[PDB]
Amino acid sequence: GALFFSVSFLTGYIPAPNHSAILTPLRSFMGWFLLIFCASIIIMGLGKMSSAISDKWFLSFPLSIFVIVMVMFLSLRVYWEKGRTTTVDGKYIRTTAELKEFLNK
Amino acid sequence: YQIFDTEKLDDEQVVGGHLALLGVLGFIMGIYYISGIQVFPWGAPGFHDNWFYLTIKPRMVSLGIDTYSTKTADLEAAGARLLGWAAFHFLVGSVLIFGGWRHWTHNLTNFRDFRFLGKFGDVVFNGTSAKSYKEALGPHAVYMSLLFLGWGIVMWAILGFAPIPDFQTINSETFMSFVFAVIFFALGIYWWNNPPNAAIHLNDDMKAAFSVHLTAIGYINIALGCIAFVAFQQPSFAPYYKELDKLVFYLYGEPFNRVSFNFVAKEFADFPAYAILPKSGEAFGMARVVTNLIVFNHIICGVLYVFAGVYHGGQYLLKIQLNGMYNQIKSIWITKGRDQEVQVKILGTVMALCFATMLSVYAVIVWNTICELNIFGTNITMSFYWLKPLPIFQWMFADPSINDWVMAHVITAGSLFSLIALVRIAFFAHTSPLWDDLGLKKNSYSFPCLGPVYGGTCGVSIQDQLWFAMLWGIKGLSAVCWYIDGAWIASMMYGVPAADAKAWDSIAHLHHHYTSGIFYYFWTETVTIFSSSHLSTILMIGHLVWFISFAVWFEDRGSRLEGADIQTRTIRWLGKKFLNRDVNFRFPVLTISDSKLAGTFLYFGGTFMLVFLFLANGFYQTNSPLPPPV
Amino acid sequence: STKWYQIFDTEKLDDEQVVGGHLALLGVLGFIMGIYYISGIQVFPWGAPGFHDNWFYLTIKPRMVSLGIDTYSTKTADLEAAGARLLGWAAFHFLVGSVLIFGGWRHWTHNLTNPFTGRCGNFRDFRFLGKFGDVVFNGTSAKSYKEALGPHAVYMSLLFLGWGIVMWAILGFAPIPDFQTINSETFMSFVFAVIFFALGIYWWNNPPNAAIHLNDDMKAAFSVHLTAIGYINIALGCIAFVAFQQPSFAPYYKELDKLVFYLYGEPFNRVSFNFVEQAKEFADFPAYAILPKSGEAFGMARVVTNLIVFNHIICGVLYVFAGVYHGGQYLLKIQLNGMYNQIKSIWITKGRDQEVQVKILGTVMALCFATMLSVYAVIVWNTICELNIFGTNITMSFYWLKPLPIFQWMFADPSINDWVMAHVITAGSLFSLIALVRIAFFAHTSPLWDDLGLKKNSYSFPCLGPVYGGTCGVSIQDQLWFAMLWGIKGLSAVCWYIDGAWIASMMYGVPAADAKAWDSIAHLHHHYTSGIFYYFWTETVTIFSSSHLSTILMIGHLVWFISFAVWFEDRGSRLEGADIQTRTIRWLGKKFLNRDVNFRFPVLTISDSKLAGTFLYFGGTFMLVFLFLANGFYQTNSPLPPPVS
Ligand code: BCL
Ligand code: BCL
Ligand code: BCL
Ligand code: BCL
Ligand code: BCL
Ligand code: BCL
Ligand code: G2O
Ligand code: G2O
Ligand code: SF4
Ligand SMILES: [Ca+2]
Ligand SMILES: [Ca+2]
């Protein structure tokens, strides 16, 4: 997909506000490459895993999947969504009555 | 389903069938014409409106048979003209059916050598007939010249239109009909002085000629659909179409004037009980609706005709491969696939190019979706919004955007995807490289299984490949429908309530607000469908047909066979219990080839039964773009 | 042909091997439970916020509230106490699961040596404990599953007593016989400990005899226990739906509606293209932060109830189907082995006569056909009447058809909807039972295959060819797939009913007149969310609103229409297409590779194609049904007025 930058230069488009025009085709090509690369990784890894799994893999499969989901939740707190959605004044409004109170405001 | 096989019919049988069918077409044309007369000359209320007649109506407006005028007397005069023309169609169709029966049944008087309009039939064609098809191309062209000349003289004499050659009026149709009569006459006289040379359709040729002509007609129908979509959008055709937006239409199955339960109350005043409620044409965009119906009908009919032409050509190819005629065809249309190495090259190239472009466009679509829903923290600035048709290609599209790019790439990918199966039909009809490697050849146009071997061998036959071609072209036809109904095919959820879903209009600065993304289009069309009971019934019936197709689609016929044996035993036992020795009613389970036939029939039938609802709910595309979400 | 889904097959495993596998699974499950408990920490004991309300934890939550853990408190100190208890119990689960995984590995290796005392413990002979085993059993179950039921019930009694003790000491719930309050589950745990100890000692002194399973327990006992526990799971789902709707559970479930949740993937406050964090919708919350979703509008109580109930229900139905399939596999094994004629028990001898099989399957088919035709005619007639086609108003519909007053006790608002729900459940049960009976009886030879001289010689053979124009999918595996597809309808009915939908008609609530007048003529205080077809339109509002649910929607749909490719009769077409693909990839030769491309494009076997097709079909269908149950309850207790007075 080395030609994406060229066609971006040849197309007449207005970039998104306050976003670099140079990196936009880079972003889109990175997304396309990521999608194709992750699909290929999934296909190849599962093709190799079908043949690599055995009775000696009994110690690996459950625990490895556990590790995957463990770091998945850890990422859910680490990089993806951090916090309890604290209110800017500082709160964790859990009671719906407070939600009506701030719908009044 | 093979009762009208070409090998069973002679040429005169084909002539008779075609004549009977043209007569019945005239009869149903009269049926539609009398089904569209808004107010009778009697003065009584007439037929409300039909999608048949709403499709036909712009043509009658162009021809002056029917008018869009707002005067009751004008509509009565239009109905009188409609009834007169319907009676003419009825009578001429009756005559055509009479000829069809006199030709299907060989009772006349010389079909091998005859005279056609002998007074000048000795001037043209030397007072003799067209012995063979190559000699028949000439007289066929001259007959079409006579048809064009007849249209011209009828338009001038009965419809009273001028021969003015300016291409912004029906007088253009008159002038060009005369010009086409002249051109067809020239082509026919040349062909009579020199018959063509494509010998493959001059031997036993019914299936071969039928296949090639059906493919040509299918491509002609696709071209006609594109041409009609462009022209019906042109301002010159606007007087005959855009007035559909300016008129109201009362269609069957619309929400009736809702009655009460203690009624001798009604919803709307002065409109009687159970009365079809009025609809404004501006809300439906009835001009776009009608052109969508016509164009998509032509497009799907062309696609199906191409697929069936390829299938019948594959049938003929298998026939000439079985009796050894394949290896002695001097026509280039066989020499380019006889080597069986160019076949592999062609199919592999088509598969690879289809794979590349389809993977590219699918990746673009899913990335647009991901940037839409902010999955994995992707903003809308990460999408393919820079990606547009080039200015060189921009003249093809109005309001150029990623939508048009994805539409073009998707339709090309779908064409190539169906072409994969079409080429498989075209080349591997008797010999396939795998089946040459396996040592097993094929001998029937419908051999479904050939047993579970090398993992299984389902669906190798020509007929099964036709079914697969139709299945894969369903996606291309859906793309066509969704583009002509205004759906945003570039992404999956556009205009949906979510983050950065409206933002497209603020990002691409579009002058046309498209309806919805792929998955939000169903919702935004069913919001209008569910009002109509008729469209709802079509919706449910289409889904019913679709899922009943799966009982014969899946690899389950044997399970159905043993279950039918069990059902037969149960029925026999019970009918012998409560009734005396009644033994009958074996449960019939369709064979696997017939199972695929029925499955494709139901699948296509339902799917496009529902696509009709997509194309008939309304356009519902606004010119005002969505605001930024900010 | 040993595939990657046959390496863990029981035929290759011993009793100790499966013991080790079960213990490894229990430990891994404990580790996963620790993950979930950590995921439920709303405020970290460090003094910081917590995790964003995973569906896993949102399901786990009310049960934790039943215990001393996980207070329904907006007060930060008490919520920190909740987090502390959750984290501590998660660490305890982690430790116990680690020890369980260690024991599972020891039993997988058949290496049972105690580090403190260098002795080897024989699996066939041992004492359960130093003195307790000699007190109760004086030995070990003699390697026979029937003799183990006693000790197994004794161990279950021990576990019940331990649960009572844990509730008494750590969780502080004193057993009292008041069954409305929480502090009776421990009293009933003690009662069950007594009852199951009695049953265990009785079964140890008097082992029940069903000699079919003992020989090849690995499949026969597996099938029987799996079907039994599938029905147990269905019963647990029903009991859960009834109880979670009771006022006794209300302090632990209705309060879930009172409190709001910040879910992962729930829509965030949307910033503009130019947000100078040095324009933002909902500025009070921080940028790209999850907007609260109110439980009262979301119906979180019934959403969690539905998730639990349908999880257990579908797991039970799948377990029933798998039990029938594995029993069919065992029956095929003994049919090829000649042991089918030698079983000598009622569970086989009754089905040994093919005419009895014919009678049973014919009765099931007749009942299924009659009930299905009746209920389907009712549904389509209601749809016709409400859409008014053929000139029929809803007065001609089946609104009069209520459940019988004697049978009305088990419904909230008696209506045609409950009637159709019950009839559809019975019809779908019999519909799947047709294929389950086919697996049970026709594992080797159907009466057709008795008349036509063929016999099924494998559990995963594709077919028998195009002979007789059929033979597709007569393998017990393929009958299982058909049973699963047939029970998809029943599971869908279950989900739509528990979520709230008008199953008696198709388009209920559409802008048509008599569709809206259904409630007016039916006299219902409950307004069902919508009809069968209108259910999607009404319940996809939230699914579209939430980006995460839309992502699941797309992925499930992709999975389904990829299942389509392997479900159809196209394997040979795909094989020749793959050969063409291989030939063009070899045509990458002379594209300047100089590398022999030894990559044959693979195409799945039909026995594998149906496997993948069913797995993806079920997976997409119920990945989407998860969104059905996660859209919300959205049932308002307000009857609809007639459109026209
Ligand atoms: C022969 C079958 C039936 C019949 C069935 C139909 C059907 C079906 C339809 C009509 C329609 C019409 N018919 Mg009629 N009709 C018949 C007999 C007649 C007679 C008569 C002399 O008795 C008349 C005056 C008419 C008149 C009319 C018009 C009111 C109307 C529009 C015609 C027009 O566009 O034609 C223009 C005429 C021509 C261009 C003549 C040449 C035809 C060309 C060759 C057709 C193929 C073109 C395509 C591009 C492929 C070319 C491929 C190769 C390159 C050559 N029909 C008989 C009874 N009638 C149409 C309709 O109602 O529109 C809404 C319509 O589609
Ligand atoms: C112009 C574009 C096509 C073309 C269009 C058609 C179409 C379209 C049909 C045929 C049909 C036939 N074609 Mg042709 N035909 C072409 C060129 C050829 C050539 C040739 C090149 O010389 C040959 C040898 C043939 C050969 C044949 C025969 C196999 C058959 C006529 C026999 C008969 O009994 O049919 C008569 C058979 C019918 C009466 C049954 C099928 C039609 C329907 C079911 C009935 C018509 C009424 C209709 C449903 C009423 C409308 C109701 C409203 C929708 C509410 N075609 C080109 C390639 N031909 C017909 C046939 O059935 O093929 C199998 C047919 O339908
Ligand atoms: C353009 C004119 C016609 C056409 C005319 C014919 C004729 C005539 C015959 C067939 C026949 C067949 N047709 Mg065809 N066919 C067309 C469209 C198609 C399409 C399609 C693109 O979807 C398909 C899949 C088929 C399928 C088939 C097969 C069943 C069969 C050919 C087998 C083989 O060995 O071919 C090998 C051939 C090829 C690989 C292509 C050959 C192309 C020739 C050499 C022309 C030059 C190509 C060049 C790029 C064009 C430049 C433009 C110039 C102006 C010429 N047709 C169009 C509509 N077809 C044969 C049969 O038996 O019919 C029953 C037959 O005799
Ligand atoms: C309700 C309790 C159920 C039950 C629930 C489960 C569950 C749940 C699991 C097993 C597992 C196994 N069970 Mg069991 N099983 C029951 C009754 C039995 C009986 C019997 C009474 O005769 C026997 C002999 C077995 C035998 C077995 C083996 C096939 C396997 C463990 C040994 C091994 O080391 O695996 C070698 C391999 C491993 C231990 C791990 C391999 C990797 C992963 C974890 C396998 C997951 C498969 C699948 C996704 C499980 C999904 C459940 C669904 C979500 C509903 N089960 C009871 C009635 N059993 C596991 C197994 O492997 O299933 C195929 C498994 O998943
Ligand atoms: C067992 C495998 C895993 C594990 C996985 C799970 C799972 C999975 C769950 C818990 C949950 C619980 N775990 Mg734990 N947990 C383990 C180890 C432990 C140990 C321990 C010292 O071993 C303890 C004290 C606990 C403590 C607890 C509680 C905090 C909590 C509720 C228990 C309860 O209601 O049981 C009830 C006890 C009984 C019914 C009696 C004992 C079991 C009897 C003998 C077996 C039959 C009943 C069976 C469970 C249900 C079948 C009913 C049919 C009608 C037959 N875990 C190991 C590491 N833990 C629950 C949760 O968090 O809820 C939200 C939960 O569902
Ligand atoms: C009731 C307790 C258990 C049960 C316990 C067993 C036992 C024990 C055995 C089987 C075995 C089998 N099980 Mg079972 N099984 C149950 C539920 C089912 C269901 C179901 C969906 O209801 C199905 C389809 C199956 C399927 C099967 C077959 C694979 C196989 C029997 C074949 C045969 O010839 O049967 C012939 C048919 C019968 C004998 C039917 C009649 C049943 C009883 C004996 C008679 C009285 C019941 C009466 C008819 C119904 C009304 C009263 C009831 C109390 C409700 N199980 C429940 C969960 N199953 C056997 C096998 O080999 O496993 C691998 C085996 O060893
Ligand atoms: C509503 C649509 C459907 C039916 C109607 C039906 C009828 C039926 N089928 Mg089916 N089926 C699917 C849908 C329907 N299958 C799908 C979408 C799949 C994809 C996986 C599928 C798959 C398999 C496999 C693999 C096997 C079968 C059988 C088997 C039966 C045998 C006896 C039986 O089940 O009695 C129980 C009786 C019923 C199942 C039918 C009662 C009528 C009802 C009220 C709905 C009426 C629908 C419609 C109005 C009728 C037509 C009139 C008008 C519209 C022109 C049997 C009556 C097989 C056997 O013969 O043995 C069981 C077998 O092996 N299937
Ligand atoms: C997303 C859905 C689908 C594909 C992806 C696909 C891929 C594919 N198939 Mg398919 N298929 C259906 C859906 C899909 N079939 C349905 C619903 C039916 C029911 C009728 C069906 C049936 C048949 C028959 C009967 C035959 C085939 C073939 C054939 C190909 C050979 C080369 C080609 O056509 O490339 C053109 C196709 C591609 C560009 C596909 C690769 C990227 C893609 C753009 C989208 C990427 C989606 C992604 C891979 C999913 C997960 C990503 C990640 C998690 C790993 C070939 C690449 C056969 C042959 O080998 O020759 C054509 C053959 O005989 N089919
Ligand atoms: S179509 Fe059916 S019988 Fe034929 S090979 Fe496929 S599964 Fe076997
Ligand atoms: Ca529309
Ligand atoms: Ca819902």
Coordinates of C-alpha atoms and ligand atoms in Angstrom, one line a residue, chain B residues 21-30 32-33 55-60 63 65 85 88-94 96 144 147-151 154-155 158-159 173 177 180 184 217 220-221 224, ligand 1:
Chain B
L21 CA -45.3 -14.9 -25.2
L22 CA -45.4 -11.6 -27.0
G23 CA -49.1 -11.9 -27.2
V24 CA -49.4 -12.6 -23.5
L25 CA -47.1 -9.7 -22.9
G26 CA -49.5 -7.5 -24.9
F27 CA -52.4 -8.9 -22.8
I28 CA -50.7 -8.1 -19.5
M29 CA -49.7 -4.7 -20.9
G30 CA -53.4 -4.1 -21.5
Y32 CA -51.7 -2.8 -16.6
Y33 CA -53.2 -0.1 -18.8
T55 CA -43.6 2.2 -13.3
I56 CA -45.4 2.5 -16.6
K57 CA -46.7 6.0 -16.0
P58 CA -43.8 8.2 -17.1
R59 CA -43.8 6.4 -20.5
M60 CA -47.5 7.1 -20.9
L63 CA -46.3 9.5 -25.2
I65 CA -51.6 8.5 -23.6
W85 CA -54.6 1.7 -26.4
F88 CA -55.5 -2.2 -29.3
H89 CA -52.9 -4.1 -27.3
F90 CA -55.5 -6.8 -26.4
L91 CA -56.4 -7.4 -30.0
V92 CA -52.9 -7.4 -31.3
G93 CA -51.8 -9.7 -28.5
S94 CA -54.7 -12.0 -29.4
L96 CA -50.0 -12.8 -31.8
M144 CA -36.3 -4.8 -36.8
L147 CA -40.4 -2.3 -36.4
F148 CA -38.5 1.0 -35.9
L149 CA -40.2 2.4 -39.0
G150 CA -43.5 1.3 -37.7
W151 CA -42.9 3.0 -34.4
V154 CA -47.2 5.4 -35.5
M155 CA -45.7 8.1 -33.4
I158 CA -51.4 8.3 -34.1
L159 CA -49.4 10.0 -31.4
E173 CA -37.5 9.6 -30.5
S177 CA -36.6 5.8 -34.8
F180 CA -32.6 3.6 -36.7
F184 CA -31.0 -1.4 -39.5
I217 CA -29.1 -9.3 -24.0
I220 CA -27.5 -4.9 -23.1
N221 CA -29.9 -4.8 -20.2
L224 CA -29.9 0.0 -20.5
Ligands
BCL1 C1 -45.2 -7.3 -29.4 C2 -45.8 -7.5 -28.0 C3 -47.1 -6.8 -27.7 C4 -46.9 -5.5 -26.9 C5 -46.5 -5.4 -25.6 C6 -45.8 -4.3 -25.0 C7 -44.9 -4.2 -23.9 C8 -44.3 -5.4 -23.2 C9 -44.6 -2.9 -23.8 C10 -45.3 -2.2 -24.7 C11 -45.2 -0.8 -24.7 C12 -45.7 0.1 -25.6 N1 -46.3 -0.3 -26.7 MG1 -46.8 -2.4 -27.2 N2 -47.3 -4.4 -27.6 C13 -47.7 -4.8 -28.9 C14 -48.2 -4.0 -29.9 C15 -48.1 -2.6 -30.0 C16 -48.6 -1.7 -31.1 C17 -49.2 -2.2 -32.3 C18 -48.6 -1.8 -33.6 O1 -50.2 -2.9 -32.3 C19 -48.4 -0.4 -30.7 C20 -48.7 0.9 -31.4 C21 -47.8 -0.5 -29.4 C22 -47.4 0.7 -28.7 C23 -46.7 0.7 -27.5 C24 -46.6 2.0 -26.7 C25 -47.9 2.5 -26.1 C26 -45.6 1.6 -25.6 C27 -44.2 2.1 -25.9 C28 -43.6 1.6 -27.2 C29 -42.2 2.2 -27.5 O2 -41.5 2.6 -26.8 O3 -41.8 1.5 -28.5 C30 -40.6 1.8 -29.1 C31 -40.3 0.7 -30.2 C32 -39.1 0.3 -30.6 C33 -37.8 0.9 -30.2 C34 -39.1 -0.7 -31.7 C35 -37.8 -1.6 -31.9 C36 -37.6 -2.5 -30.6 C37 -36.2 -2.7 -30.2 C38 -35.4 -3.5 -31.2 C39 -36.2 -3.4 -28.8 C40 -34.9 -3.9 -28.2 C41 -34.0 -2.7 -27.9 C42 -32.8 -3.1 -27.1 C43 -31.9 -1.9 -26.8 C44 -32.0 -4.2 -27.7 C45 -31.3 -4.0 -29.1 C46 -30.4 -5.2 -29.4 C47 -29.8 -5.3 -30.7 C48 -28.7 -4.2 -30.7 C49 -30.7 -5.1 -32.0 N3 -47.6 -1.8 -29.0 C50 -48.0 -6.3 -28.8 C51 -49.4 -6.7 -28.6 N4 -46.1 -3.0 -25.5 C52 -44.1 -0.5 -23.6 C53 -44.7 0.0 -22.3 O4 -45.8 -0.1 -22.0 O5 -43.9 1.0 -21.8 C54 -44.3 1.5 -20.6 C55 -43.6 -2.0 -23.3 O6 -42.4 -2.1 -22.9

